């Protein structure tokens, strides 16, 4: 029913280079400030899904150097991705997170022994998240999972704020989506009501993880080409949350009684993860990548002149601290100064592409129509993607066949 | 012989050690304490026939529109500057000009307060048409965090109200949202 | 996502930490406090046509001869049983 793409497509001996030049993202690492609903400084963090929608030149109307090979009848031209390059330029740095109002009341390890200060309140606490190093390339945007509060419970329950059902919501991973965490990839804006169980960056958003199961389980494999993953975490401190337990522990396991007791502690225990050491040797970027054979039936074919590259990197997530003076004084005064958190994130996207052709037969037309008809009216023989927000890059009028003028071209001519 | 470099600062706005627990209190006029600190471990060699450059963050042009302000966030801009002898390597605090943008002269060790650390830009060693600035480069850099603390002083960009619930006694004066 | 879980006990026999210093010797009435932890890092796959048998140390048969006891040490036995779902990792 479904056949590999290389059975019908044809690879030519034509290679072009594209470069995104300098890409910069500067903004506050925790929340997007806006004065009179005008976001001057948006959300910019090293803990952010970077989804780049690359638009491509039409190979059919492009100034092809050898138009003799091309035939307007029964032959169309598409771009095929060959090599990729993600140019990080910022130095190494671990991001810092936290929240001033969090439920950090007992230190179970008893080195600190916080002892749950009196009355229901909060306290300031901060930590770092895990080392996450992920990159994805594809002709379709990635799909990732997260659990959340979906449909209500079975039958007709009567309750007031009990445990909701858990549903595996699978959503397209767009720019503005929050990375996985050691606290679980939930919809904390809705599922969590305190807005105080996690640091400020993830309390009002929806963390989600790429569900590789459905990702690879696609019949056509349009949603992936190849994935690179490195993850590192280890729990550095153990603690509990306050509040009451709606699912109490049975008495059959715990013996209670006597003074200084008969009130059980919280059965809710979580941790603070840490990434430990970063290194340049463990880096997966600033190095050429070659697409020998994709796992799915899509050997780098960019249908519809659209490309999707998503990266998350924590090695370049260092948080910048700024200070300024309102006034000045003879002595050091706390009132004269204002403090700001600014984050930067630098990107280069460098690509080498190979020209691809196709011969139109009746079964070929039927297959290419069944898998996607939108491209079929594109070649002219309501995209839902306009609603979602991505980081768009335009690589039109930037393709160059003079690949020897670029370092990626040199590395490409090094091997074949 | 191999040896770890050490720096520090006697009067730094080390507000509160925050990791295991926090102590949110009203700050005084001065709360600076002596703090010792090491840097990220870095090995780097660059060679060529042209002097290598480096990126560093700084204050760019004046603020856009026609603004009147006293202590706002300045326009933060990348400046490409050629590396000379005497410059300091980037540490974990970011490749930027502390002498201009860090007003206290007190938020970092003294070795990097009045100076500027800048990290070399491999991207302009690559994207240059000739590559005269670089023949071949070696780097090996390792780093990991050991403590967490907040910063004293006012927060010029306060936290949004819809994300944080506050009330009752000991509050309506927010804690330090700056975390380093 | 790759993540580590936390267990613990609200009332565990955590008398005193002994790592660098120790408190007074004899306990009081009840010194049994809130403490949590995480377990060892495990990865294991077994594959076959017949289900695996695994062992644990348990109170086997009573002591030899005819001893009279009151909370004495029970004998140790390497008891073998088939691993079914619901059992939990060492």
């Amino acid at each position: 029913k479904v056949v590999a793409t290389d059975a019908y497509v044809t690879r030519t001996n034509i290679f072009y280079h594209a470069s995104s030049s300098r890409l910069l993202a500067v903004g506050h690492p925790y929340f997007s400030i806006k004065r009179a609903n005008k976001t001057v400084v948006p959300k910019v963090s090293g803990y952010q899904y970077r989804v780049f929608k690359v638009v491509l030149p039409d190979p059919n109307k492009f100034a092809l150097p050898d138009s003799s090979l091309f035939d307007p009848t029964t032959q169309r031209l598409v771009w095929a991705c060959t090599g990729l390059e993600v140019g990080r330029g910022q130095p190494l740095g671990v991001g810092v997170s936290g929240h001033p109002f969090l439920n950090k009341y007992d230190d179970v390890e008893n080195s600190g022994s916080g002892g749950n200060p009196g009355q229901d309140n909060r306290v300031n606490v901060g930590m770092d998240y895990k080392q996450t190093q992920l990159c994805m390339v594809g002709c379709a945007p990635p799909l990732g999972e997260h659990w959340g509060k979906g449909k209500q419970c079975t039958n007709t329950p009567v309750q007031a704020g009990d445990c909701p059902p858990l549903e595996l919501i699978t959503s397209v991973i767009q720019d503005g989506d929050m990375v996985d965490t050691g606290f679980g990839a939930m919809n904390f804006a809705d599922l969590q009501t305190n807005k105080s169980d996690v640091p400020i960056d993830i309390c009002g958003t929806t963390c989600k993880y790429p569900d590789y199961l459905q990702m690879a389980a696609d019949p056509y494999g349009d949603r992936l080409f190849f994935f690179l993953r490195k993850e590192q975490m280890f729990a550095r401190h153990f603690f509990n949350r306050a509040g009451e337990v709606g699912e109490p522990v049975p008495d059959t396991l715990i013996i209670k009684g006597s003074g200084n007791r008969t009130s059980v502690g919280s059965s809710i225990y979580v941790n603070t993860p840490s990434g430990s050491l970063v290194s340049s040797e463990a880096q997966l970027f600033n190095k050429p990548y070659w697409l020998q054979k994709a796992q799915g039936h899509n050997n780098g074919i960019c249908w519809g002149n659209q490309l999707f590259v998503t990266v998350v990197d924590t090695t370049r997530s260092t948080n910048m601290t700024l200070c300024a003076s309102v006034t000045t004084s003879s002595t050091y005064t706390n009132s004269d100064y204002k403090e700001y958190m600014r984050h930067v994130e630098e990107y280069d996207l460098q690509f080498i592409f190979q020209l691809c052709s196709i011969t139109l037969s009746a079964e070929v037309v039927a297959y290419i129509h069944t898998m996607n008809p939108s491209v079929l009216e594109d070649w002219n023989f309501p995209d839902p993607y306009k609603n979602l927000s991505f980081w768009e890059v335009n690589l039109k009028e930037k393709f160059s066949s003079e690949l020897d003028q670029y370092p990626l071209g040199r590395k490409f001519l090094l091997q074949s | 012989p191999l040896g770890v470099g050490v720096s520090g600062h006697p009067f730094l706005n080390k507000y509160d050690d925050v990791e295991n627990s926090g102590s949110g209190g009203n700050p005084g006029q001065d709360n600076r304490v002596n703090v010792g600190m090491d840097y990220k471990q870095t090995q780097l060699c660059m060679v060529g026939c042209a002097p290598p450059l480096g990126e560093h963050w700084g204050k760019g042009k004046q603020c856009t529109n026609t603004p009147v302000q006293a202590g706002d966030c300045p326009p933060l801009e990348l400046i490409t500057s050629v590396i000379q002898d005497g410059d300091m390597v980037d540490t974990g605090f970011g490749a930027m000009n502390f002498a201009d943008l860090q007003t206290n002269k007190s938020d970092v060790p003294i070795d990097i307060c009045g100076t500027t650390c800048k990290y070399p830009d491999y991207l302009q060693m690559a994207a240059d048409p000739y590559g005269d600035r670089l023949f071949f480069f070696l780097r090996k850099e390792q780093m990991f965090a050991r403590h967490f603390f907040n910063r004293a002083g006012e927060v010029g960009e306060p936290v949004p109200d819809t994300l944080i619930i506050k009330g009752s006694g000991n509050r309506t004066s927010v804690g330090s949202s700056i975390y380093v | 996502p790759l993540g580590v879980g936390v267990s613990g006990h609200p009332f565990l026999n955590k008398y005193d930490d002994v790592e660098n210093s120790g408190s007074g010797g004899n306990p009081g009435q009840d010194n049994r406090v809130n403490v949590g932890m995480d377990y060892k890092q495990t990865q294991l796959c077994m594959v076959g046509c017949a289900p695996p048998l695994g062992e644990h140390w348990g109170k086997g048969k009573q002591c030899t001869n005819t001893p009279v006891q009151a909370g004495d040490c029970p004998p140790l036995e390497l008891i073998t049983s088939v691993i079914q779902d619901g059992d939990m990792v060492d």
Epitope: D106, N110, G112, S113, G114, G115, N116, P117, G118, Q119, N260, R261, S263, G265 | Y15, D16, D17, S23, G24, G25, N26, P27, G28, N31, S168, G169, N170 | V33, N34
Partner: antibody
Framework: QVQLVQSGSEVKKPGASVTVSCKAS????????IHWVRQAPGQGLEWIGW????????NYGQKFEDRVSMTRETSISTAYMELRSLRSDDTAVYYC?????????????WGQGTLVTVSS | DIQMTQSPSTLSASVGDRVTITCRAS??????LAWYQQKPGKAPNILIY???TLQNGVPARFSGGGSGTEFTLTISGLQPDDFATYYC?????????FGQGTKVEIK
């Protein structure tokens, strides 16, 4: 044993400043919350404020947030509290006291108290 | 500020009697309460906390209870050393506040 020792009783003129110190020993001094309260003859207990040696983070009551300034030092681990604009009604005994919230415990310690008398 | 009223302000009783002292809170406190007794010239110490929990080293004749704003303390059997001034303090919110006090003295 955790020992907390306050300064001796003092008599001062109105409008002046007083300084009350109390040295603590026998425990990790930095990680605890030390508190100032005062007891007037014929009236109940009331709370002045609280500081911890970490950060010197102060917090004052709504009543006495203006006339007081209080700090700590870790060399011999002593907390100082000074009062300005001595009103004649402030003649009272003053107590510094610390508390550790345990998992299931509360470790309570008080100073011996210091009498402060103000008159013309 | 959170206020409270202790009733009765003054009570007289003989040895071995059962006596109940109450206090009313201005706002809700739940169980964040403790009780103090002060002997003349000496610093008071904790006897009851958690609104129901005895402190260690203290005899079990001393009992506490209550919820919301209504809180009670009971002595089943008086002793001569127990005759002192009694207060209830919430540690709910800052500022900390104490009652007017309750003095007990032998009949």
């Amino acid at each position: 044993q955790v020992q907390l020792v306050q300064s001796g009783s003092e008599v001062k003129k109105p409008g002046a400043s007083v300084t009350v110190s109390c040295k603590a020993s026998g425990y990790v001094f930095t990680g605890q919350y030390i508190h100032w309260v005062r007891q007037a003859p014929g009236q109940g207990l009331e709370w002045i404020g609280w500081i911890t040696p970490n950060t010197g983070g102060t917090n004052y009551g709504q009543k006495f947030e203006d006339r007081v300034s209080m700090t700590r030092e870790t060399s011999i681990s002593t907390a100082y509290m000074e009062l300005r604009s001595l009103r004649s009604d402030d003649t009272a005994v003053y107590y510094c006291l610390t508390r550790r919230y345990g998992h299931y415990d509360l470790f309570e310690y008080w100073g011996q108290g210091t009498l402060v008398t103000v008159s013309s | 500020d959170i206020q409270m009223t202790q009733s009765p302000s003054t009570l007289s009783a003989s040895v071995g009697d059962r006596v109940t002292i109450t206090c009313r809170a201005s706002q809700t406190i739940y169980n964040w309460l403790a009780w103090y007794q002060q002997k003349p010239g000496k610093a008071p110490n904790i006897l009851i906390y958690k609104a129901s929990t005895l402190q260690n080293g203290v005899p079990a004749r001393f009992s506490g209870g209550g919820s919301g704003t209504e809180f009670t303390l009971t002595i089943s059997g008086l002793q001569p050393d127990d005759f002192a001034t009694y207060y209830c303090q919430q540690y709910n919110s800052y500022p900390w506040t104490f009652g007017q006090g309750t003095k007990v003295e032998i009949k």
